[PDB]
Amino acid sequence: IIGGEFTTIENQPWFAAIYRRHRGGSVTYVCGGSLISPCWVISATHCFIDYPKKEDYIVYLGRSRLNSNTQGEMKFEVENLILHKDYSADTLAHHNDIALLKIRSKEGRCAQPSRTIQTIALPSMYNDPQFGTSCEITGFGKEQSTDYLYPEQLKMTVVKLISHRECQQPHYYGSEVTTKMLCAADPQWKTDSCQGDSGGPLVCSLQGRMTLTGIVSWGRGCALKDKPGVYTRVSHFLPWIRSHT
Ligand SMILES: *C(=O)c1ccc(NC(=N)N)cc1
């Protein structure tokens, strides 16, 4: 997250921290995700595509810090890693950038809700807020494009939804953005998602309910003028989510 503020898991209790075990046993942070039911985390296929083996991954719920345990956190194996078979990626745009992780603890349990572990509602089909709506994004990604390190503390920021029309413009992304993507950005381009935030949630309030409108997916750089963050338009993937859960 470029700009924004530090937070704890109490303020995004559906947020999933997904890590990969390297051959040799070392564990590095991969991507965010969102708990959509006790046994299901939703994330981005791009996060997993190079290392598609479910056994290499660890999912935490209730976790506020990158490399330190949060009190109350729960640790899961991935019992099913479902990538989108229509996934495609060019130099920038990621298409069908959506992934499902069925989670299972060593004791064979799904998430148990708590002050720090809750599910997020999916949108109603094709039901998205209007352009200019303020939404939140959460993650452990870079605080600056030039950073090497990821922050140790979870971050959140607010971005505003951009129309398909505005996002299609020349000096934006042209035809790189489709109706199955949502663009969001700051009016001053001062806050954004960045490397390590992908897979993570874009949450909007829809008819007074906190809703997973988006999945952090792609962008040209981070917090660049005329280069908004691009999100998987969750409301356009309900049949795929339904058929895989
Ligand atoms: C994901 O890791 C990801 C998503 C989006 C960006 N870029 C922007 N939001 N501009 C970088 C990395």
Distance 32 CA to ligand 1 centre (A): 12
Rg of the Cα trace of the chain?
A: 16
Return the closest-CA partner of residue 42 out of 14, 21, 74, 63. 14
Residue nearest to atom 1 of ligand 1 (CA): 198
Pick from 29, 158, 216 the residue to mutate for probing ligand 1's pocket: most ligand atoms within 8 Å of its CB: 216
In this structure, the residue with its CA closest to atom 9 of ligand 1 is 229
Integer Cα distance of 42 and 44 in angstroms: 7
Cβ(238)–Cβ(122) under 8 Å?
yes
**Positions marked catalytic:** 46, 97, 198
DSSP string, 39-90: TEEEE-GGGTTTS--GGGEEEEES--BSSSPPTT-EEEEEEEEEE-TT-EE-
The string of DSSP codes covering 115-131 is SS----BPPPTT--PPT
Contacts of 91 (CB under 8 A, 6+ apart): none
Method used for this model?
X-ray
Burial class for 159, CB neighbours closer than 10 Å (0-12, 13-18, 19+): buried
202 CA to middle of ligand 1, Å? 12
Q: Residue type at 31?
A: C
* Residue type present at position 78: V
Ligand 1, residues at Cβ distance < 6 Å = 192-198, 216-219, 221-222, 227, 229
CA distance 78 to 83: 13
Q: What phi and psi, each to the nearest 5 degrees, are found at residue 236?
A: -100, 5
Record the resolution, in angstroms: 2.0
